[PDB]
Write a protein that binds this ligand. Structure first.
Ligand SMILES: [Fe+2]
Length: 187
């Protein structure tokens, strides 16, 4: 339970393996360790594979089945749907640039406009946390000039979620795909 500052991305991953050795998750400790890693672009360049048209998901570590650790690369103006997290913990740490996170409540069964609960600007090295009990979110790179790169940890791993129609609250199941795994493009 003794948390030390990760010296490198590799060191962070080693620490994460320790933190997820059991069946439960100390959220505050995981967030603190992620926050404490100082982004070093040389260490994650291998995973930072962008697409011109949308954000990409790049698998870094499979957490011996306990978690997926991945790097997401957001071109200028790229963003996500309003989505849930499939009964998993979700940690988001900025490695480069800024992202806007908008929070939404779970919709009622009635067809209605989903109104923003709040928004914040997540900045370099900051780590946010979300789960389904907190609500839904959208994550966007609103920059016109700066690509963003973020480090995401989901536990347990999941490869499907829901996207919500902002106009109605209607949801559709979506399958998440990986752009690359362990530095290797996986078309
Ligand atoms: Fe998310």
């Amino acid at each position: 339970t003794e948390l030390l500052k990760p010296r490198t991305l590799a060191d962070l991953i080693r620490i994460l393996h320790e933190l997820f050795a059991g069946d439960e998750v100390n959220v505050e400790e995981v967030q603190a360790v992620l926050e404490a890693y100082e982004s070093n672009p040389a260490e994650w360049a291998l995973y930072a594979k962008f697409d011109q048209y949308r954000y990409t998901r790049n698998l870094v570590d499979q957490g011996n089945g306990k978690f997926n650790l991945m790097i997401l690369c957001w071109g200028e103006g790229h963003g996500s749907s309003i989505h849930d997290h499939t009964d998993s913990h979700c940690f988001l740490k900025l490695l480069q640039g800024n992202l806007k996170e908008t929070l939404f409540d779970w919709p009622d069964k009635k067809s209605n406009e989903m109104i923003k609960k709040s928004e914040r600007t997540l900045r370099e090295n900051q780590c946010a946390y979300i789960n389904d009990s907190i609500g839904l979110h959208r994550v966007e790179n609103v920059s016109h000039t700066e690509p963003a790169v973020s480090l995401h940890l989901y536990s347990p791993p999941f490869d499907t979620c829901h996207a919500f129609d902002q106009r109605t609250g209607h949801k559709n199941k979506v399958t998440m795909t990986f752009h690359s795994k362990f530095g290797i493009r996986t078309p």
